[PDB]
Design a binder for this molecule. Structure first.
Ligand code: MG
Length: 216
DNA sequence: TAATTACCTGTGACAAATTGCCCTCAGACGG
DNA sequence: TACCGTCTGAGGGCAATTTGTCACAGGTAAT
């Protein structure tokens, strides 16, 4: 089939800002970690390239820039507690191979109240906020492949660390919500719809229902 | 009744970031 | 054992799209 990512809901719902490339590598880190405690993971350019249909060159570029873009990035678990992703710079012992040092204090948060999806399910998504949304929906996914969940807008904004102009709702709709629904519906197997929940003039939650394209 | 205010909404416009894409050239390796 | 061609990937760039930010116009209700 394809690699099965599983992760604690606390990571699905953590507050952080990562790019697509960084989240993709992070999925591979979570897989390596799950196999076995040292916090040391490894990524091969050619393996990354084959997984995500990239060139060796563009794989190398994506890995390198994601990796140097991790510096200063932080992850927040709201039970809040903030951690750095990396506790040592990445480095390449051999050409085409990178070794990275994830904060070992993060190990128990990566590994019964959990979220799971196959990597082929997410590897064509481009917008990182749409990967965050697809992970949050997976957290509520039933065996058959459908689910329903109400997410609060403030919680969406804080958890996905959406940029400030998306606190203006028409921009939230236009540049995040609609784009990620279209992206998920066109690039994943999940078939996603939504409806808006209001309180007075303000929209407070977004209600997601979804099904799997193995059904009608 | 009318005008101003305090909310919301959508879209046009621009800036900034991100995309897959292109070209160069050395390291590793095997032939 | 030694040289060179090939594949790899570590770099430099790119224009076309996507994303992020804001001015502006319209609607409504409170006042
Ligand atoms: Mg790239």
């Amino acid at each position: 089939n394809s690699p099965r990512i599983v992760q604690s809901n606390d990571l699905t719902e953590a507050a952080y800002s990562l790019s697509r490339d960084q989240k993709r590598m992070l999925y591979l880190f979570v897989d390596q970690i799950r196999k076995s405690h040292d916090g040391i993971c490894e990524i091969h350019v050619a393996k990354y390239a084959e997984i995500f249909g990239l060139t060796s060159a563009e794989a190398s570029k994506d890995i390198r820039q994601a990796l140097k873009s991790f510096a200063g990035k932080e992850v927040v678990f709201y039970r809040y507690e903030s951690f750095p992703w990396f506790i040592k710079p990445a480095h390449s012992p051999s050409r085409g191979l990178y070794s990275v040092h994830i904060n070992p204090y993060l190990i128990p948060f990566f590994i019964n109240r959990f979220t799971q999806f196959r990597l082929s399910e997410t590897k064509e998504i481009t917008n990182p906020y749409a990967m965050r949304l697809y992970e949050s929906l997976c957290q509520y996914r039933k065996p058959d492949g459908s689910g329903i969940v109400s997410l609060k807008i403030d919680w969406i904004i804080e958890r996905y660390q959406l940029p400030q102009s998306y606190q203006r709702m028409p921009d939230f709709r236009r540049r995040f919500l609609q784009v990620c629904v279209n992206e998920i519906n066109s690039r994943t197997p999940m078939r996603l719809s939504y409806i808006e929940k209001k309180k007075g003039r303000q929209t407070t939650h977004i209600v997601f229902s979804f099904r799997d394209i193995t059904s009608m």
